[PDB]
Amino acid sequence: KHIVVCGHITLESVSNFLKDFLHKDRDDVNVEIVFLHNISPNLELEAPFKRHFTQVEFYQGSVLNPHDLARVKIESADACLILANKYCADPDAEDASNIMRVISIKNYHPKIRIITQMLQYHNKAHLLNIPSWNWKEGDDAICLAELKLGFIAQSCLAQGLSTMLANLFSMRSFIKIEEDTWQKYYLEGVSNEMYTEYLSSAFVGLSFPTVCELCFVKLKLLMIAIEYSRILINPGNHLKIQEGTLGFFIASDAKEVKRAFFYCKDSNVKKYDSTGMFHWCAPKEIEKVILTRSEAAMTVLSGHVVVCIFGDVSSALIGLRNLVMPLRASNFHYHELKHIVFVGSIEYLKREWETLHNFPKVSILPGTPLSRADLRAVNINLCDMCVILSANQDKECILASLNIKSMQFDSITTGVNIPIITELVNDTNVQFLDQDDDDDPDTELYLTQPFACGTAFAVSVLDSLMSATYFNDNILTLIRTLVTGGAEALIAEENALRGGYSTPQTLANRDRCRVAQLALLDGPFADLGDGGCYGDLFCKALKTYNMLCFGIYRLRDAPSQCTKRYVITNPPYEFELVPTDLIFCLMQFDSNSL
Ligand SMILES: [Ca+2]
Asked: 359: CA distance to ligand 1 center in Å?
């Protein structure tokens, strides 16, 4: 068996790909990895790969040449993977070049499975016009803008979620440490992966919550979703398991997951898009949402999302709707929607506005993330999250967080505990975000403190999704569903959310779970918070509320003034809680909430 890898083939991308792929591949003895690359080969370590990896072949050529497709044997290849140049100055041109690759490959052999990266959502949509593009039969498009900004969006609801999800398809060996440090418990959580498996016929007729509890208690498996088709994430009491239901699980090894299969014994007004999946308003002219610094200072905002954008009129477009849209999912109540305030170049942001103008509660302060006056005007110290992004052309981004941290407010307080997530292009630059951690350029991103705490994200963590998708493309579908707020045909044609009137059928689409974070200082889980065990909390949340818990966000220093928290995914039943812990969970929509 063999796969063909093409597109952006460099020493960096080849090595990174092989690292992911060969960690996950259980039958690597019998799988040939064939790289096809355009320019002549400088033995850019072409030779070393030939030593280290004896099942890795290189071919000079293009997937646009039918003879080169015959030379690498596309007709009998298990899949063709297309790596994008993620940092291209012109994402539309890069996407078009990869769509052309798909067209050429599919012309040569229609039934070849293709997995491709796409930079922008609007280009992903063009693949549907290729007749032989068959997503049902395994053709996959990994959209980088959609996923990266989705991961970030959900992290505005529960900080650390981006890290947790990333680590569920990180294909690295579990690493152990003996001492009782924060790293120990983080690393126990890192060993988890997402799997799918059919549910035992013995579960048929039982409710998801019942089966989920049985999996947790009896099998030590965390089941998060099912598919009869679309994926239901933590469905409630009324949803019963049918024959041939596929379960989605989080576990330490694939062997454990097998137990789940073998188990024995308002009416006149348009307020939503036409599907009822997202909040929607009539298109506003950008002048209606632009604030001056004085105007912004008059309205005190709190619980809001401040989005700091580095970029000028000439920058490549980010696709900011990929951030905003999940934060406008219809399974949020209008009143709980987080106000989004963009701080950056108005001539940049004017170019994004066409695909943002139907989302409510969006403001723009023309200015710069480095201006303390702008940040004070938008109440940076009271926000639920500050997101720091750069448009395509790290030091600007890093400087902005350092600047925020050192600001003083109001007893005067610093900005050191302000919630921030910074997008980095270069993994190495994670070293400069925190001043109280161990730095090393050779240490991978996932082990660093900013990543472990969910204060840094890089599109590079999505690279491993390519290998993950090859081995199990249900994992991509789950991740996309979770981070985008749920889902496409109408958007593929129009490239815009059309408004629509509410019916019973469109309003029923509101009833799906949302990401949230549970505190343990008071309320019904406080007794368990005080030295109780995670498993009792999990069962109580699930039985009483159909609330599914999937980890802890724990204080690094659980005497200390540091409020930094790190992710602990899928902890065991007996794991001991502390009162300051926050719990990652999926909560049911509550229609009567007020
Ligand atoms: Ca550092």
From this structure: 37
